[PDB]
Amino acid sequence: SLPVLQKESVFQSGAHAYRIPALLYLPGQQSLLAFAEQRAAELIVLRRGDYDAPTHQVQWQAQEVVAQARLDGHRSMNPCPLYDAQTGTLFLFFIAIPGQVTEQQQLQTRANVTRLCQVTSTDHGRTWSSPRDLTDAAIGPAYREWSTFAVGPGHCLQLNDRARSLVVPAYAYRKLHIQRPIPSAFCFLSHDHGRTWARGHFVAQDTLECQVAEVEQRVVTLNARSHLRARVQAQSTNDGLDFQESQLVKKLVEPPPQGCQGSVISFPSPRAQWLLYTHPTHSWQRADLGAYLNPRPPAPEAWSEPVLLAKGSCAYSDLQSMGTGPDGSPLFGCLYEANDYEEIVFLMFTLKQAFPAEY
Numbered sequence: 517s518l519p520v521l522q523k524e525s526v527f528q529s530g531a532h533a534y535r536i537p538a539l540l541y542l543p544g545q546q547s548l549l550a551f552a553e554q555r556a557a558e559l560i561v562l563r564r565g566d567y568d569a570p571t572h573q574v575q576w577q578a579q580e581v582v583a584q585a586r587l588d589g590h591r592s593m594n595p596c597p598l599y600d601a602q603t604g605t606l607f608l609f610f611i612a613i614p615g616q617v618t619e620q621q622q623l624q625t626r627a628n629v630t631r632l633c634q635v636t637s638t639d640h641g642r643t644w645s646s647p648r649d650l651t652d653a654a655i656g657p658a659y660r661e662w663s664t665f666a667v668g669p670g671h672c673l674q675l676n677d678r679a680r681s682l683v684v685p686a687y688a689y690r691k692l693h694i695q696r697p698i699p700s701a702f703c704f705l706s707h708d709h710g711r712t713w714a715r716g717h718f719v720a721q722d723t724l725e726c727q728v729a730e731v732e733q734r735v736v737t738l739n740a741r742s743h744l745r746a747r748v749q750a751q752s753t754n755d756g757l758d759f760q761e762s763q764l765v766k767k768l769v770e771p772p773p774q775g776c777q778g779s780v781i782s783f784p785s786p787r788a789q790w791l792l793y794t795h796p797t798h799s800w801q802r803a804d805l806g807a808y809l810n811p812r813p814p815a816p817e818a819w820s821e822p823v824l825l826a827k828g829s830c831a832y833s834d835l836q837s838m839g840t841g842p843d844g845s846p847l848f849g850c851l852y853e854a855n856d857y858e859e860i861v862f863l864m865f866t867l868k869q870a871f872p873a874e875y
């Protein structure tokens with residue numbers, strides 16, 4: 517597999533199990549915040565890491581529970597971090613669900629009991645505020661038309677528009693017809709730095725967990741998990757409110773079962789931005805994590821062949837652009853589930869290492 521600057525297990529099954537990673541880079545701090553669900557999904561945990569370029573390594577501090585990221589009598593899941601570069605505030609969106617509830621029970625029961633929450637930190641994640649239940653104000657009446665919903669999982673997005681809008685990728689299971697609820701991706705939008713929220717319009721049916729990135733004029737690309745053999749990709753020219761164009765990207769395979777979550781980010785093109793995406797590449801199972809490059813975003817056909825990042829069992833992942841790397845090329849940080857969900861691995865590499873022919 518691809519030569520990397522670092523490969524370290526940051527979460528391991530012990531007294532608890534860990535899944536659903538989220539990664540967030542704090543530019544001015546040369547540090548990363550790695551989030552995950554601590555399952556018996558009861559709570560969300562976090563580990564802070566300081567990146568030292570001279571040693572090509574990130575030093576990870578002790579794991580800590582995000583105590584405030586929970587509602588009484590509920591399980592917390594789907595950590596979705598975001599850093600507001602204008603207010604200096606760190607956001608951690610997440611979903612809370614009643615304890616007396618499971619997952620399969622959520623998908624179809626026609627009774628939505630899922631809550632949308634957020635906690636903020638003004639000291640780089642050291643301490644957090646009390647949770648804010650955004651459910652009613654951010655969703656509205658539509659709430660009753662869904663069996664359930666979720667955000668991310670994974671890092672969110674802040675646009676370079678006038679308002680420096682906050683965009684939270686998400687999806688809802690909607691009771692459309694004698695069938696089972698059908699999932700459609702969408703984005704929660706805020707133009708006042710998380711003060712108030714609005715629900716964006718749905719993308720094509722049969723799209724789940726997704727992530728968004730901003731490209732160059734201004735377009736928001738959405739990459740979503742689907743129930744088909746390929747990923748679904750959509751574009752928005754109005755900051756996420758509407759995702760007009762939408763299509764299957766055959767080049768980006770989805771494992772047989774129900775597919776698998778993937779990650780996507782934009783980063784400064786070496787030559788304004790290029791995209792990077794990570795997801796299992798095995799056509800019959802969740803294995804062999806691959807990195808894909810799109811140097812002519814968002815063109816679906818411009819997606820490249822995947823480069824092998826890690827062999828073996830691999831699932832969910834999250835990416836973060838970490839600025840300039842040791843070799844002068846774009847540096848990347850990646851967090852992914854591995855070995856039948858026995859751990860979550862941190863991987864750090866550069867564009868030169870992954871796509872030598874494009875740098």
Ligand SMILES: CC(=O)N[C@H]1[C@H](OCCCO)OC(C(=O)O)=C[C@@H]1O
Pocket residue numbers: 536593594619623666724774
């Ligand atoms: C909120 C929640 O239960 N998330 C699930 C997510 O659900 C997908 C929709 C299925 O119909 O899938 C998986 C998964 O490993 O495949 C892990 C997450 O923890």
